[PDB]
Design a protein around this ligand. Structure first.
Ligand SMILES: CC[C@H](C)[C@H](N)C(=O)O
Ligand SMILES: CC[C@H](C)[C@H](N)C(=O)O
Ligand SMILES: [Fe+2]
Ligand SMILES: [Fe+2]
Lengths: 255, 260
């Protein structure tokens, strides 16, 4: 009869994880991506396009490997009797993934393309990558798809967490924290990409994907014993560090 | 370059799949569960309770192992380029799971409890198993939890499909075919449970779980996830196995309703 840790023990896990995120240099003030997105004067199409391709692959992998992690947990709950407080947290994960896979929240369903075109990595590909690709060469496009080492390392960690029953809680706990600052950074960068001196993105609804996200924006509820709690913090530490290294790679390329 | 098979080959897979469901004797007129549910004059609390406990465990495993199977497919899609037609079929699996996990379809959310109390195996436990359990002895309650062999075999197949990237497609293809007849069967069975001379289910709203399932299946493809001919053969083999085990588990229900 599986149950979550007592509340006060879960509050401690929340504080420890909020500290690891601090420690990983992911806050609006500490990560170079959020800073460069604000500081830099203009962005070349090739630089903006490369970051857009990297993000497409990162968010694709985030969605699918978080769903896989939820499935790993589902496999366990098929063979145990999770109590209703655990089941509620399990439902939350399913609901949150539904933003990226099916535009669940009204902030998304009103504006997103329907069907598969609305899946968030596809919607990003169609509305950010594609208009930038017209301003770059095929050789550039192929180069952008050879992902840099910090992005590759984060994707490798997502593949490992795809098999971990704690994996979806780890990924959503970290990503939900930094999501809004990422979205605001993108709103800024792609307003500053210029081609014939002129902005590539110059209408309102070319930012639909980004603005829907800024509008739109407990996981420890799935920890069932103190040991799994320790594993949760260990995994958050690894994953938060890899996310930070990947976002600094964004900042470096934008300069 | 990951794409569904051409529409001609998928239509052929669909026909082979319908034939496997026919051969498994899962149709309305074939399976002993639907027959017994229509024919029996009355159902004892102990017999109704046992079937409801077995059902609770079967539908709990169906939900979690189908979601696990979707996760196994997600593992593969994380590193491949599935085209938009595959992605659309993937979205559909996610949406359909949401009925049981989150009462996604409006027919369900209009009556279901909110939060985890609305998960379908939990809602069944609270509204069907619990009122029946008031009318059975402790010995009988413990016996009901000793699941019979055909039920255990089906749960084991569900565990095996939890790891299979085709597993969610296999389970939904079969269950969506038989869901209406199962729900109608339960409406008939639990309408005929009497304790003393009184109906155990004497108020319309006690049937809410069953009536919602009947409406959702009434008022309203998985082969689209098959990406080559070798996977198509595996899909048909898995459907044959899984449909056979579903039919045997339902035959076990029918036997319980007609026992000496
Ligand atoms: C990593 C996920 C981010 C924050 C966003 N939800 C997206 O669709 O890309
Ligand atoms: C096996 C699933 C059946 C058809 C129903 N959806 C339920 O919640 O039990
Ligand atoms: Fe998203
Ligand atoms: Fe259901």
């Amino acid at each position: 009869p599986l149950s979550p840790l007592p509340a006060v023990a879960r509050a401690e896990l929340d504080a420890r994880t909020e500290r690891e995120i601090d420690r990983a240099r992911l806050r609006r003030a500490d990560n170079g991506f959020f800073r460069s997105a604000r500081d830099v004067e203009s962005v070349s199409p090739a630089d903006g396009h490369a970051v857009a391709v990297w993000w497409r692959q990162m968010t694709k992998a985030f969605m699918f490997t978080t769903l896989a992690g939820l499935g790993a947990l589902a496999r366990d709950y098929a063979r145990r009797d999770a109590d209703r407080e655990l089941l509620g947290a399990f439902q939350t994960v399913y609901q949150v993934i539904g933003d990226d896979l099916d535009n669940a929240a009204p902030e998304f369903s009103a504006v997103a393309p329907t069907g598969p075109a609305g899946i968030h990595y596809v919607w990003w590909d169609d509305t950010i990558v594609a208009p930038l690709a017209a301003h770059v060469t095929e050789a550039d496009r192929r180069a952008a798809e050879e992902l840099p080492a910090p992005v590759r390392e984060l994707l490798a960690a997502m593949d490992r967490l795809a098999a971990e029953p704690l994996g979806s809680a780890v990924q959503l706990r970290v990503v939900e924290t930094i999501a809004l600052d990422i979205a605001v950074g993108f709103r800024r960068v792609y307003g500053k990409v210029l081609a014939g001196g002129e902005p590539v993105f110059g209408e309102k609804d070319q930012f639909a994907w980004i603005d829907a996200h800024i509008k739109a924006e407990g996981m420890t509820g799935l920890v069932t014993d103190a040991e799994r709690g320790e594993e949760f913090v260990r995994l958050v530490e690894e994953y938060a560090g890899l996310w930070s290294a990947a976002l600094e790679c964004f900042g470096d390329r934008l300069t």
